[PDB]
Each structure stands twice: as C-alpha cells, then as structure tokens.
Amino acid sequence: GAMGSMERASLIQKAKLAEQAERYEDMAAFMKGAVEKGEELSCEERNLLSVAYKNVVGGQRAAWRVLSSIEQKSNKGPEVREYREKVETELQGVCDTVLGLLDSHLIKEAGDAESRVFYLKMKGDYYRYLAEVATGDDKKRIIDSARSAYQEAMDISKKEMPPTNPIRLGLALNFSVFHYEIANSPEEAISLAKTTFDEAMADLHTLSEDSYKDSTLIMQLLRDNLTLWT
C-alpha cells in the first residue's frame, strides 16, 4: 500500500509519535503499513494497532449515534439520512480494513495464546461494530461472526491464560457487552461478567503489584457494568 516504501521500524516509530500527537487516523495508517510488512506483531505493536483503530472507529461510532438519533427524532428532507449513511459507510470501511488485516494474515500466523486471543477479540469487536449499524440482511451472519470469534477467543483463554490475564479480562468484558447490547442476552452478559470477576478475584493473590493494578482496574470495569445491569 501507500506505506510500502517506509521501513517497518519507522512505521512503528511514527505510530508512537502519532499517538502522542493524537493523530489517530495517521496512527492507524502507520500500523496498517506495519502489518502489511508481513511479519508477526509484538505485544507492544499489537497494542498500538488496537489503540489506533479503536480511536478511529470510536469517533465514527460516536458520530453515527448522534446522527442516528437526529434521524430517529425526525421520523424534512434526505440530508440527515444521507449523512448518516455516509458516516456508516466510512465506519464499515474501517471495520472491513481491520477485519482484512486480521484475516490476511494476522490470525493464521498467531500461534501463541496471547497473540491469538488478542486478534480474535479484535475480530469479535469489529464484527460487533458492524452489528451496531447492520439492518435486515446479513445482520444475523454479522452477529454470529462476532459471537464465533469471541467464543474461540474465550475457549483459548480459558485453557491457556490465568483468570487475571488482562487480555482474558478485557475479552470477557467485551463479550459480555456483546451479549447485553447486540445479542439481546442480558442474563448471559451478567453471568459472564460475574463468573469472570469472581475467578479473577480468587487469583489476585498470585500477582505482583503491577499486575495486580492492571487486573483490578479491569475487574472494576466489570463490576461497573454489573452495577448498571442490576
């Protein structure tokens, strides 16, 4: 692509600079370039990829929700619908780009549990974002694609990672949000969050101070959702 002439190391360095500059579109383009070099990503590089695209799609989703709300209230000419559609298409394009990176070829080359779970979680999340805007057709298949990705990630994480692992915790958080917000399965959402929280609590004693801080931070987010849901 357009980053084909830049060194991998330079792309990663520029992604870090773009993060500091709050230039997330640039950050995402740099990390896409890095992925397209064809090498596996390190832990830190996976995090950069994730931060970049979460910020890009986050802005798009926030805009979509503002516009969708205006459109619903109005139900005046075609403009709100047209502009909501424009933002929607752009969002779908970003999701498709991320999903394309995961399929070509990040997931298939990810053999370690940490990397494979991370990428399958991402796959679940980006199908989830597609589901948020999907209507009528393919919507069921999109939801099932999210579910299938999260489920594979869960199965690996349960076998290969401690219950306090931040990736495992974040996966559970997001899969529980999927159940609550997308799958109309609030009880599954609550069960998953509660079991995840309790199993993590019981393993905190094994952790260093730094690991403890990370795990308990995510546990508090699980608890926050349980509070909102009950």
Binding site: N47, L173, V177, L221
Partner: peptide, 8 residues
C-alpha cells in the same frame, strides 16, 4: 450503550 473496554 454499556461501556466496553477503554484504551490501556
């Protein structure tokens, strides 16, 4: 919407 995982 329920909050999902924030950035690290």
């Amino acid at each position: 919407r329920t909050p999902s995982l924030p950035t690290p």
